Ligand binder design. Structure first.
Ligand SMILES: *[C@@H]1O[C@H](CO)[C@@H](O[C@@H]2O[C@H](CO)[C@@H](O[C@@H]3O[C@H](CO[C@H]4O[C@H](CO[C@H]5O[C@H](CO)[C@@H](O)[C@H](O)[C@@H]5O)[C@@H](O)[C@H](O[C@H]5O[C@H](CO)[C@@H](O)[C@H](O)[C@@H]5O)[C@@H]4O)[C@@H](O)[C@H](O[C@H]4O[C@H](CO)[C@@H](O)[C@H](O)[C@@H]4O)[C@@H]3O)[C@H](O)[C@H]2NC(C)=O)[C@H](O)[C@H]1NC(C)=O
Ligand SMILES: *[C@@H]1O[C@H](CO)[C@@H](O[C@@H]2O[C@H](CO)[C@@H](O[C@@H]3O[C@H](CO[C@H]4O[C@H](CO)[C@@H](O)[C@H](O)[C@@H]4O)[C@@H](O)[C@H](O[C@H]4O[C@H](CO)[C@@H](O)[C@H](O)[C@@H]4O)[C@@H]3O)[C@H](O)[C@H]2NC(C)=O)[C@H](O)[C@H]1NC(C)=O
Ligand code: HEM
Ligand SMILES: COc1cccc(OC)c1O
Ligand SMILES: COc1cccc(OC)c1O
Ligand SMILES: COc1cccc(OC)c1O
Ligand SMILES: [Mg+2]
Length: 335
């Protein structure tokens, strides 16, 4: 048995600001079995009941929740969600854990596929995050107070005590440098190289209240509330427009950087990878991930094959727009 996965939701009918921390979506504490992970956006949505409070959801539920709760732009939602689902979800049950492994995603897929959730390191989740530490140090998912203290420090140093685009530029680079110096397994290429820039502007574009139209900047109180406690600020109103990675280009421009990693299990040994995706070679990310999916699913048949074909297509519909045109790949043929 299994599920027939629907195509992704489109943009919301209403795209203006609104109160999202409302009576129908109260913060609630974790219960036993509830899953949380490396994403403060999804974490907050689950802890306010925009997602199932147990942190396991369908792609469709994730897309709608990111739109409803934060006005995450539809294409960005599709690109992120099916990326996470293809690599880390259960394609038969159509369920993805926003954190680690759980029976709630249903019967496990055939290895080497895992449905292990967004916590799985090395193809999606990766190094030099803002409030999470690299997997090498033992925990890639929990809030890390030391890293948050650095976030605060950089906000004091470059943003007048607030997180803004200038802070994002400085913090992104400094976090790269931390990982070069301390993590001999540090990788910063392919998916991670791309996602690591967008992630640093989401707090500006999506965590700042939507009633703020000029000089958008995030207070440390609001940052702590979301990044640490998975709680919307009091009276939080979402972005007044669909938004995602606006300004990520400026973050890169502040400290130009090339995909790569520390070679040969050694610190301070960063080598460029000329084959990696980058921001002028985005379709390589698409091809790379399709390749990764084939490694996870070398010979699917039946429902699994069907659901793979559909999810791959759904992802491509977003990638095609977001990346400015990529030739669709059909590793398992057609339906
Ligand atoms: C994230 O948050 C941060 C923090 O809030 C935020 O930072 C602000 O960013 C803006 C711009 O990005 C800053 O405003 C600019 O400041 C520039 C630097 O100014 C210095 O130099 C000025 C020029 O000096 C001349 O004259 C002196 C003699 O006095 C001489 O030695 C020099 O050689 C030179 O010839 C000087 O005017 C200025 O001093 C003034 O302001 C300070 C207060 O900061 C005051 O104490 C002084 O008495 C004096 O009034 C300072 O020393 C400046 O160049 C720049 O100017 C341009 O823009 C203005 C306005 O648009 C025009 O009027 C002007 O003609 C220029 O074209 C501008 O004012 C601001 O200071 C930052 N604030 C802080 C606290 O750091 C980031 O922007 C945020 N990021 C995002 C993306 O939002
Ligand atoms: C929350 O997140 C932080 C940050 O990721 C974690 O703290 C880091 O923990 C790691 C592992 O203990 C530390 O790594 C070691 O750092 C040494 C360098 O430290 C100095 O230099 C850096 C800047 O270059 C400063 O930030 C720091 O304060 C020090 O002044 C390295 O020399 C070590 O290398 C040795 O081990 C590696 C791995 O085996 C080898 O490859 C090397 O060859 C060598 O033998 C090592 O990498 C790191 O410094 C910590 N950072 C900070 C600033 O604390 C927290 O543990 C994590 N946990 C919490 C708080 O919940
Ligand atoms: C749409 C589906 C989403 C998926 C699948 C997703 C997935 C992820 C993953 C896997 C990470 C960890 C990245 C890493 O370690 O390399 C992450 C980080 C992050 N996500 Fe999400 N995310 C989604 C939506 C959102 C939304 C809507 C927001 C903001 C409103 C958001 C904000 C963030 C931020 C700020 C981080 C960085 C956390 C840190 O470094 O401290 N995400 N996300
Ligand atoms: C990781 O996803 C993306 C990377 C770069 C650009 C995007 O949309 C404009 C985008 O959605
Ligand atoms: C659309 O782009 C993204 C969505 C969710 C998380 C991301 O980086 C961690 C990211 O870059
Ligand atoms: C709606 O169109 C499709 C649905 C599922 C799979 C497809 O091609 C792989 C496809 O083209
Ligand atoms: Mg990470």
């Amino acid at each position: 048995q299994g599920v027939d996965p629907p195509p992704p939701p489109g943009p919301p009918s209403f795209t203006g600001t609104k109160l999202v921390n409302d009576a129908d979506h109260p913060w609630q504490p974790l219960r036993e079995g509830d899953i949380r992970g490396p994403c403060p956006g999804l974490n907050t949505l689950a802890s306010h009941g925009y997602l199932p409070r147990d942190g396991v959801a369908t792609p469709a539920q994730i897309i709608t929740a990111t739109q409803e709760g934060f006005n995450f732009e539809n294409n960005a939602a599709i690109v992120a969600t099916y990326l996470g689902h293809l690599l880390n979800g259960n394609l038969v049950t159509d369920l993805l854990s926003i954190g680690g492994a759980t029976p709630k995603t249903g019967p496990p897929p055939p290895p080497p596929a895992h449905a292990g959730g967004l916590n799985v390191h090395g193809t999606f989740e990766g190094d030099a995050g803002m409030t999470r530490a690299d997997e090498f140090f033992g925990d890639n998912h929990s809030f890390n107070q030391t890293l948050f203290d650095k976030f605060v420090d950089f906000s004091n140093r470059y943003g007048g005590g607030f997180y803004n685009l200038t802070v994002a530029g400085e913090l992104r680079y400094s976090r790269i440098q931390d990982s070069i110096a301390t993590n001999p397994e540090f990788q910063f290429k392919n998916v991670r190289f791309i996602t690591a820039y967008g992630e640093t502007v989401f707090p500006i574009n999506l965590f700042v209240d939507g009633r703020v139209t000029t000089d958008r900047k995030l207070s440390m109180e609001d940052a702590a509330s979301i990044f640490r406690d998975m709680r919307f600020p009091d009276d939080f109103h979402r972005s007044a427009v669909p938004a995602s990675n606006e300004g990520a280009d400026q973050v890169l421009a502040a400290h130009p950087w090339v995909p790569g990693g520390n070679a040969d299990n050694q610190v301070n040994n960063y080598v460029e990878d000329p084959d990696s995706a980058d921001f002028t070679h985005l379709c390589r990310l698409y091809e790379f991930v399709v390749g990764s999916v084939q490694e996870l699913y070398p010979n699917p048949t039946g429902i699994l094959r069907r659901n793979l074909i559909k999810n791959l297509h759904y992802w491509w519909t977003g990638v095609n727009v977001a990346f400015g045109g990529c030739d669709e790949l059909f590793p398992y043929g057609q339906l």
